[PDB]
Write a protein that binds this ligand. Structure first.
Ligand SMILES: *[C@@H]1O[C@H](CO)[C@@H](O[C@@H]2O[C@H](CO)[C@@H](O[C@@H]3O[C@H](CO)[C@@H](O)[C@H](O)[C@@H]3O)[C@H](O)[C@H]2NC(C)=O)[C@H](O)[C@H]1NC(C)=O
Ligand SMILES: *[C@@H]1O[C@H](CO)[C@@H](O[C@@H]2O[C@H](CO)[C@@H](O[C@@H]3O[C@H](CO)[C@@H](O)[C@H](O)[C@@H]3O)[C@H](O)[C@H]2NC(C)=O)[C@H](O)[C@H]1NC(C)=O
Ligand SMILES: Nc1ncnc2c1ncn2[C@@H]1O[C@H](COP(=O)(O)OP(=O)(O)OP(=O)(O)O)[C@@H](O)[C@H]1O
Ligand SMILES: Nc1ncnc2c1ncn2[C@@H]1O[C@H](COP(=O)(O)OP(=O)(O)OP(=O)(O)O)[C@@H](O)[C@H]1O
Ligand SMILES: *[C@@H]1O[C@H](CO)[C@@H](O)[C@H](O)[C@H]1NC(C)=O
Ligand SMILES: *[C@@H]1O[C@H](CO)[C@@H](O)[C@H](O)[C@H]1NC(C)=O
Lengths: 878, 867
């Protein structure tokens, strides 16, 4: 299967756009509203269709295009929810379009072709004949689809012959127009059907005698009477030509709006008329305005003539290269249609009188097609041409709606219409054709183009709005599988299309638009619920699971680094031998530092064997959940059963979360009684966990002396948090006290920034820097710099220099002494502090100097009531 | 601090509801719309407010009540997004209410109290309104700036004025019933003349023993002589009557003014039911008939009258100083609503039944001698209602001017919206500083319209937006079972709040659809902006933060509730085994998982890497990228976990039991087959396989062991001829039947024939068929003989080493003679032994059982599978 762009995309879209709306209701629309407002309407109705076509192309290019049709692409590229929603609005639009074309064919048959074989009598004739035609067309569609697909070329040929004849007639009008006298009464419009000739008196047998017009206007058959209406005798009777040759005075004439009312009379603005009363037996003698005309009504009546851009991408499977052949073809069809309407609007407006355009049924002329009056060969070619075009459009719509319904039914998206997929032995639908025919009858029972057209418009506008909105949303949030290759495509275009087509959908009828939107929302949510129930198993719980998975998948792609740094903690609790939380203050501290917003996972390892201790794990999980609910901290809880607690801690540290929902901080407690007991396990386990959390580039929070930390009911009134930032990790060391004081427990503790990084430098510049940095934070904490020394900070400087370059025992003995001098300073100037935060030095590289490192950490925090040590990970930015 | 229900909630709400609409625009509404439609209007405007009061009570009952005010409760109980959105609509409503009350005070000053002080003296009335409203707005802002304390002291007086006014109205009516007042209104045929100009309504009067033309004649006929015939035909053709304007209460008037009489702009107020002979008229007479001022309809009347019943959120405004709020707020608010509704109903009926249908339609009381139309019936004098309404309007304006900037200051100090942080810079006392100025500017921009009949709909739009948002939030949070939302109200049900949302939305669209669209877009923009700011504050990114927050919210909500699903769908964990060069050994497992899930569900891909964590981080990260790429190729959407353990066996276990977050857990482990276990000299592989098998059966997980993974098809291949074989032996029938269906759901197995072979036979077949009806597979069922002795191994393991092999070899014989040419064979395997040493024999069994079959997949049930 391989065919080019032309015979695969261009000709079908053109054949679907040229409909009956042009002939039957273009001239009337142009004359009633003028040339300006008509051109503006055409432009407004082409822009929405252009933005929808661009979005449709952006959809049709990303990835491969499914070979099924025009509904499979939408579904595959926008999800089952959207695809299901789009298919149904399109189905309803198609069945009402078939109905409307049947109405057009009936109207053209009973009014101009042959009126003998026929207020509300006309409506009843329309109903009866439309029902008969619908029956016959449904039967034909049942038996003879092959012949329709055979004869489909003829309908386009007829349309082209008709348009060629119209333009040829115009070009012949410019230099030699036809003759079609329309009769006048002052500034009124007479129906030429009854009268033989329009003249008050005629000369018969050497003398004047009253004409049929007289006898119809005056009840007296003798001229010598004075009991007639004043308007007839007061004004004249003229015979102006109806087809004035092309000129700039006529296009100047019919240039301003002429919106009439229901029942008014078609009047020729620009003739002398002296008003007077009139009888009530004369109204059947003037031409009358049939329906109330406005701007929104004309929008609604014209819109079904620019629809069908989804009909071009309808033989997608039998295409050579669809990605490059569908969009260009569709847009070329749009451009051709827009230019044909513009040129025809201007030619009609500028070539025909402003009073004969308003005869919806061609009353001024002797019951002819008003647009058929200007046609070179004869007015009989356009009538037959439009008749065959209407029949063909009806047949093709009745062929193409049931196929869409059958596809949607066999896709098993909406469950209650599975039966509509019981196709024939060949695949042709059976109980979808019946539903379509019944809805078409329900539409025919209205029997008026001016009321069927807005419903059709609502369905199509809803479909287009949905396509555009889906495209824009999927582009904004970076949907995982959505990458279009179109060059001139940008989500701003789809947004503008949504706005314009929404404005149209609301101009026609706000309440109808609300009903359509509610139907669409109901079907969308119902599809979503059914999909959730089918993938997972539950309705409500299934919805939540699906939302979670969607969010995680979308978060997967993209740069995995955030411009800011906020602590997301993982609290490593240590369960007792009796399965009790040893330090229930860690949970309290986590709740005070997070305040219930963010991610907080709470892991714990249970020594033993997994094969025989599963119930223990479940019990411990419930226990931790209860204890965690009490302290009011909202988080998940993981429990693993390892053989040795060390490897359990490792597996917990490096594997907790799903993709992007990872922790970036490990808060572990302090080992108490490590030197007291003879078992040296404690400090080696602690140091091993420290080394394992520093090699994964994670932050570290080691709250020392956890038994003295406040509870949530406690409150502090006087006190000041103390920060003792030594060299590095300034960002997190400044971000912690702020997030802490944001809680009511530390609601008003004064912050004091103590800095010890003299390094033979000046504090004046560092004070200005700290203050300006604090200005953005707005903490405004007092900054004081203590007189620091290089030899005093030697322990930290060694590591700092090594870190800068990257960007033992001799040193350790010195480190202990520096640790004790620093401890002396801090305990003499910050003893009475409420909470003290200072950054700790990194663990040694040598696996044996760990005891000295522990002695350093113990002699450093000697005397301080409450001290929290934080170690940076190195990837923190702010 | 402790004060009761009455003086803490009831009276403030009453003071906020009874407003100026009642006096200035009730009679006009009743006369224009009739009695019936008036009752309907009152009912419609009371129902939306009643449902909103019920939802507000449900909010005020869950948990403890914040002591701050009326905005803190909403925030704490509905989240920062909703609470922030509500605050702005309520703020705008309050400032426009200040504007409307000022307009009411100006209108009452220029029309009844003193008409000479009309400086401008059409558009002159509008310009006078503009100037005087500006002067008052300035003066009231300054007063509110300096003297809040005296306002808080004198606030009771305004309520005293309102109550005395209403009591006087009813006293006047009751006096009307048996002895009415006198207020003659003059008539011309069936029109209504303005009684201000004429001295007396009579065509001719007798002066000095003779008749002379009266002032009415000179106004209608410009000639001062009776002997003239150059006047309009309407004056001479019709009569001049003087009907009483206040007929005492009776059933004849309520019978008259009972149907709607919507006029048009410029029409004439006509008394239906009087003799009138029509005739043309001049154009210099229009200044002498009373005229309808604006076009009247039904929707217009709803829009103008809705502000009267607003203010139910002002009752829960001294929340901190309350004795027991949970039992005192709802009952107080609802009693205030009921009292207001009954007062309106009784007053509507009283007006309908006491006043003529022609004097109700003079919006400014022209038929009567420029009096307050409602003041005609009042016992002491019509002077009590005028002064009463003046003081009431000034007091309500003052309190709105006091209560709006305070709310803005609260929102600014809550630090939700960042660009209005400056508005929290209160004075030394707490009185707002740059919030009062902004409020005064908005009030001026509202005054520039200078017409109650045009300001009222804007006020209504904002208040309706607030109520709709409250109701919708309550209903949704009750439906989705948010974790921290449990209301204690007795008569509360999410259907009621939903119905309230529907009704108040209907109102919002009846009044003016376009305004409703603008309000909804403002609300949506602020809602999404608050959500974005919350994301920026918790996580760090705007978009990535939004996604993280959505994920966390979904997981937390899914946490609570029954942890068992009615259905069972496989959620796989594919255990890949990386090579020494960090390449996927069997990339066909990922293909098989993608075929079994079809891209919908959860699929985690774990793998263990032997070594030490301290020195092997980069290898793990590189392997993570490798697995992600290989998984992207096969088109399977899933997450990837890699852990670095010491001994692989141990790492596996930890991978099996800890993967996921809370409720997003796996329930099926698909591991490959150990190849070369007996051929390999070392016995390390089977020792690992058996350990993973034993560990995954003790966690109650299903098990899928695809054997011979090197012959499984890829995605590009297609099958035309073949038949899947299922060999369900004893147990695990549900999942053994659900697997082939989910498999054939993919295009690769799109049309492979399914054959069910099952080791009373009619009863069993009937059961399989009835079960198959729901599934709809309709696959052919073939039941081979069932020997208990042959299957003894499965029965004995569920509920002799030499015998094991004999049964396995007979079963292998049967399967290979009746299913050798099968495409895919699925059969359930027996459980591994409890003894840790018979693993070699167990492996020999498993090897000799599936001997000859090209492709065989073995499934073992977990035991908690339902379908
Ligand atoms: C066709 O002829 C009739 C009668 O001559 C035109 O009637 C229009 O409307 C009324 C009579 O129905 C007259 O207009 C009056 O004009 C004054 C001056 O502004 C205005 O104050 C009145 O309210 C009324 O509009 C007059 O006969 C004529 N007026 C206009 C502006 O057309 C009718 O318009 C004619 N139709 C055409 C010319 O298309
Ligand atoms: C006050 O008197 C005026 C003038 O008489 C009333 O206006 C006109 O009243 C007459 C008599 O009711 C109406 O005539 C009726 O017209 C309708 C069709 O419009 C016809 O079906 C009836 O059989 C009858 O002929 C006339 O329409 C009406 N309006 C005008 C412009 O003449 C006025 O209605 C009286 N007040 C009230 C409250 O009725
Ligand atoms: N079983 C465990 N599970 C999780 N973490 C542990 C465990 N044991 C120790 N830790 C980590 O080390 C700390 C305690 O270590 P250790 O048991 O050596 O001293 P403890 O005072 O006896 O308790 C805990 O706060 C935690 O950080
Ligand atoms: N290092 C590993 N990482 C992940 N999974 C493994 C690992 N080793 C074994 N497995 C799992 O157990 C199965 C048996 O692997 P084993 O190493 O015992 O056999 P092998 O293929 O002969 O080597 C593998 O198919 C895999 O499912
Ligand atoms: C009617 O036509 C006659 C014939 O020319 C003309 O004289 C007369 O003025 C016309 N009347 C009007 C009202 O134009
Ligand atoms: C005016 O009133 C007199 C008083 O009886 C009455 O006779 C006359 O008919 C009235 N005029 C009309 C037009 O009814």
């Amino acid at each position: 299967p391989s065919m080019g762009t032309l015979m695969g995309v261009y000709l079908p879209c053109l054949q679907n756009i040229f409909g009956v709306i042009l002939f039957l209701r273009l001239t009337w629309m142009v004359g009633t509203a003028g040339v300006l407002q008509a051109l503006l309407i055409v432009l407004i109705c082409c822009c929405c269709t252009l933005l929808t076509a661009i979005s449709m192309s952006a959809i049709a290019t990303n990835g491969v295009v499914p070979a099924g049709g025009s509904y499979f692409m939408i579904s595959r590229s926008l999800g089952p929810e959207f695809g299901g929603a789009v298919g149904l609005c399109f189905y309803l639009g198609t069945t009402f379009a078939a109905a409307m074309y049947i109405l057009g064919a009936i109207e053209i048959l009973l009014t101009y072709i042959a009126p003998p074989a026929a207020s509300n009598a006309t409506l009843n004739n329309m109903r009866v004949y439309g029902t008969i035609f619908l029956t016959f067309m449904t039967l034909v569609v049942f038996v003879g689809v092959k012949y329709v697909n055979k004869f489909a070329s003829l309908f386009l040929a007829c349309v082209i012959i008709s348009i060629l004849s119209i333009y040829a007639g115009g070009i012949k009008s410019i230099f030699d127009p036809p003759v079609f006298p329309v009769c006048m009464l002052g500034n009124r419009t007479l129906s030429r059907d009854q009268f033989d000739i329009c003249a008050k008196t005629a000369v018969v047998d050497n003398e004047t005698v009253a004409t049929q017009l007289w006898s119809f206007f005056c009840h007296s058959p003798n001229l010598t009477t004075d009991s007639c209406d004043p308007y007839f005798m007061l004004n004249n009777v003229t015979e102006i030509p109806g087809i004035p040759g092309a000129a700039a005075g006529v296009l100047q004439e019919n240039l301003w709006s002429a919106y009439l009312e229901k029942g008014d009379i078609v009047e020729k603005h620009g003739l002398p008329s002296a008003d007077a009363p009139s009888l009530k037996e004369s109204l059947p003698l003037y031409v009358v305005a049939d329906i109330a005309t406005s701007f929104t009504v004309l929008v609604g009546i014209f819109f079904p003539s620019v629809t069908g851009i989804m009909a071009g991408s309808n033989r997608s499977g039998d295409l050579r290269d669809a990605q490059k052949s569908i969009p260009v073809g569709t847009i070329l069809a749009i451009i051709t249609t827009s230019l044909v309407y513009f040129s025809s609007v201007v030619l009609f407006g500028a070539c025909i009188e402003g009073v004969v355009l308003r005869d919806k049924y061609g009353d001024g002329v002797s019951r002819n097609l008003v647009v058929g009056t200007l046609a070179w060969p004869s007015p009989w070619v356009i009538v037959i041409g439009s008749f065959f075009s209407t029949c063909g459009a009806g047949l093709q719509s009745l062929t193409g709606a049931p196929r869409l319904l059958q596809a949607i039914a066999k896709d098993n998206i909406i469950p209650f219409l599975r039966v509509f997929g019981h196709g024939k032995v060949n695949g042709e639908p059976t109980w979808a054709l019946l539903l379509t025919a019944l809805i078409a009858e329900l539409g025919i029972l209205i029997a008026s183009l001016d009321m069927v057209a807005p419903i059709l418009s609502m369905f199509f506008l809803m479909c287009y709005l949905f396509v555009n909105l889906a495209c824009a949303v999927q582009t904004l949030l970076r949907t995982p599988n959505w990458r279009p290759r179109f060059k001139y495509y940008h989500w701003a275009l789809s947004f503008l299309g949504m706005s314009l087509c929404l404005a149209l959908m609301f101009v026609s009828s706000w309440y109808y638009a609300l009903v359509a939107m509610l139907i669409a929302g109901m079907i969308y949510k119902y599809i979503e619920y059914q999909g959730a129930e089918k993938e997972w198993g539950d309705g409500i719980r299934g919805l939540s699971l699906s939302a979670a998975r969607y969010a995680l998948l979308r978060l997967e792609e993209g740069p995995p680094h955030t411009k800011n740094w906020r602590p997301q903690l993982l609290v490593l609790l240590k369960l007792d031998e009796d399965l009790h939380v040893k330090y229930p203050r860690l949970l309290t501290f986590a709740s005070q530092l997070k305040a219930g917003k963010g991610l907080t996972i709470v892991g714990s390892v249970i020594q033993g064997s997994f094969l025989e201790s599963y119930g223990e794990a479940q019990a411990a999980e419930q226990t931790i959940k209860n204890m965690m609910e009490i302290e009011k901290v909202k988080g998940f809880c993981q429990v693993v059963v390892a053989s040795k607690v060390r490897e359990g801690l490792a597996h917990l540290i490096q594997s907790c979360g799903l993709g992007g929902m990872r922790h970036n901080s490990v808060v572990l407690g302090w080992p108490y009684g490590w030197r007291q007991s003879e078992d040296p396990r404690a400090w080696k386990t602690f140091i091993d966990t420290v080394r394992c959390t520093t090699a994964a580039h994670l932050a570290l929070l080691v709250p020392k002396n956890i038994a003295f930390y406040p509870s949530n009911h406690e409150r502090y009134l006087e006190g000041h948090i103390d920060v003792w930032w030594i060299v590095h990790d300034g960002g997190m060391l400044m971000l912690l006290p702020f997030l802490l004081r944001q809680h009511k427990v530390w609601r008003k503790c004064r912050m004091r920034i103590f800095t010890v990084a003299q390094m033979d430098d000046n504090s004046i510049q560092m004070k200005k820097d700290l203050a300006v940095f604090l200005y953005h934070l707005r903490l405004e904490a007092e900054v004081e710099v203590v007189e620091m020394h290089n030899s005093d900070i030697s322990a930290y400087t060694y590591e700092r220099t090594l870190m800068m370059e990257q960007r033992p025992d001799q040193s350790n003995v010195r480190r202990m002494h520096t640790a004790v001098k620093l401890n002396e300073v801090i305990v003499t100037r910050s003893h009475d502090a409420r909470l003290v935060l200072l950054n700790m030095p990194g663990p040694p590289r040598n696996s044996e100097g760990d005891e000295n490192y522990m002695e350093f950490l113990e002699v450093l925090t000697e005397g301080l009531e409450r001290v929290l040590l934080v170690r940076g990970g190195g990837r923190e930015v702010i």
